[PDB]
Amino acid sequence: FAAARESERQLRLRLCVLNEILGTERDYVGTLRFLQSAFLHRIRQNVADSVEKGLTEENVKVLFSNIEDILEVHKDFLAALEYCLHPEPQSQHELGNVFLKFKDKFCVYEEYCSNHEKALRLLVELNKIPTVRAFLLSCMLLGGRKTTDIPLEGYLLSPIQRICKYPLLLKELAKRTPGKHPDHPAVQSALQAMKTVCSNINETKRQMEKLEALEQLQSHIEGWEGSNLTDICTQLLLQGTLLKISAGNIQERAFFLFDNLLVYCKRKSLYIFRGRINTEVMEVENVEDGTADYHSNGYTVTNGWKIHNTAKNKWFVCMAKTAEEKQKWLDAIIREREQRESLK
C-alpha cells in the first residue's frame, strides 16, 4: 500500500501538468488577442492616424507578421483542449490526440519565426522615431498594459517561446503517464510530433538565413555581372581557393559553388568578379595524374579536373593542392548535379 500512495502521486502530478497546459494555453491565446486588439484592430480602425504618425502598412506587416493566423490556430487548438478536458482537467483524460490533430496546423509558426529577426530589428529603428514610439506606447496603454511592464518586444517574442514550450509540457505529461494508461502512446507520439514542429521552424529559419548570406556575399564582390544570387540560388555549397588554368594565362582564383551556379573571383569587398557558369550548361571531365595537354598549357596535372563551359566553348583546368581536396570538390559538384536533376 506504499505503492498506493505512489500511483496516486503520479496522477496528482499528471493533473497538475494538464492544468498547466490548459491554463497557459489560455494565457497565450489571451496574449495573442492583446496583440491583435491593442495594435492591429486599432491601426485598422484608424489607418490614417497610423500612417500620419509613422506606421506604414509595410511596417505593420513586417512587425506583426502572421500573428493573426497563429491566433486563429490557437483559438481552434484551445477550443479543442477545453473540449478534451471537460468539464475540467482530470487524470484519465487523453490530450495526446489533440496535439496530434494540430501537429500540421502549427506550420504557420515557420513563417513567423523566420520573420521575427527582421521584425525586432525594424522595431529598433521605429523606436528611434519619436512619434512612432509614442504611438506604440499608446497602443500598449490602451491595451491595459503599462510602460513599466514587459515592452512590446517580449509580446512579439512570446510565440517562439510558446511553440517551444509544448515539447516540455508533453515530456512532463508523458513522465506522469503510466504504461497501461490509454493516453500513453498518443502522448509519446505528441512529444515526437511537436519536437518535429519545433525543429522544422528552426531549419526554416536557418535555410532562410543562407539567403541573407548569398546577398551579403554578392555585396562583397566587386563588379558583379549577371543575375543576382538570391534570384537563382538558395545556398552556397562549397568555397575554396583553386588553381585555374585557362588557355593562355594562369592565376589562382577563389571558387564558389552554389546550387545552379559556379562563380570565380580574384581575391583582394573581399573579392573581384572574374566569371560565372550555369551548372547545367557545365560539364566535368576528369584528368588523370601526370597529364600535360593543350588546355593545361602543357603543365603537369595532378589532383586536377577539366571544367567545360559549353555555353561558351571554353575549357579550363582546376587543380587542388592535396589529393583529398580534389575529391571534396568533385563530390560537391556531383551532389549539386544529382540534387538539381532530382528537383526536376
Binding site: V17, L120, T148, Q161, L168, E172, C198, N202, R206
Partner: protein, 176 residues
C-alpha cells in the same frame, strides 16, 4: 526595465529558479514548466529597480531560435547544475561562446544551481555510479574567470540559499 536573460542547459532548473525567486517560495510538489516573461519590482541598495526576467526553457536544442531572445539584453545568467558536470562543461562548449557571439559587451554571471544537492548523499552516490562528482566552488570560480564572467554565484531554488544575491548581482552588474 533591466533585461536579464537566463541561459543554460535543460535540467539546470532555470524555470524553477525564476519562479522561486519571483514568487518568494519554492513551488513544492509540482514544479511548473512555464514562466511567462516577467517584470518585478526589486529593491537593491536602497534604490528601487525594475527587473525584467526572461526564461529560455525549451529553446535549448533549437540553435537558430535561441538568438532571438538576446538583442537588448542587459545581463545574462549562464546557468549550470552543480550536480551535472555535463551542464558545467556546456558552459564552455555551448553557452558562453554563443552569448558572447551575439552579445560581446553584455555582462555574464555564472550561476551554479541545485546547491542543495552538492552534498546530498543520495545524489553524490548516484553520481559516483557513473564515475562522476559534483562541481566544487573552486572549479566553478575557475570556469567563471575563464569566460570572463562578472561574477560566480551559487544558489538553491529549494532552500532559497544565495538566490536573492544572484538577481541583486545582476541588477548591480547592469546599473554599474
Amino acid at each position: 526595465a533591466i533585461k536579464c536573460v537566463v541561459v543554460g542547459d535543460g535540467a539546470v532548473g532555470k524555470t524553477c529558479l525564476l519562479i522561486s525567486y519571483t514568487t518568494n517560495a519554492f513551488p513544492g510538489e509540482y514544479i511548473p514548466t512555464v514562466f511567462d516573461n516577467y517584470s518585478a519590482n526589486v529593491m537593491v541598495d536602497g534604490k528601487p529597480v525594475n527587473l525584467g526576467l526572461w526564461d529560455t526553457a525549451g529553446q535549448e536544442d533549437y540553435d537558430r531560435l535561441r538568438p532571438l531572445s538576446y538583442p537588448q539584453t542587459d545581463v545574462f545568467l549562464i546557468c549550470f547544475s552543480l550536480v551535472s558536470p555535463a551542464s558545467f562543461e556546456n558552459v564552455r562548449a555551448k553557452w558562453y561562446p554563443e552569448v558572447r557571439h551575439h552579445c560581446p559587451n553584455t555582462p555574464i554571471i555564472l550561476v551554479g544551481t541545485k546547491l542543495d544537492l552538492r552534498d546530498d548523499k543520495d545524489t553524490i552516490e548516484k553520481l559516483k555510479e557513473k564515475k562522476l562528482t559534483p562541481i566544487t566552488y573552486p572549479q566553478g570560480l575557475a570556469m567563471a574567470k575563464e569566460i570572463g564572467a562578472v561574477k560566480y554565484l551559487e544558489c538553491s531554488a529549494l532552500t532559497q540559499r544565495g538566490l536573492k544575491t544572484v538577481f541583486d548581482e545582476a541588477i548591480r552588474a547592469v546599473l554599474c
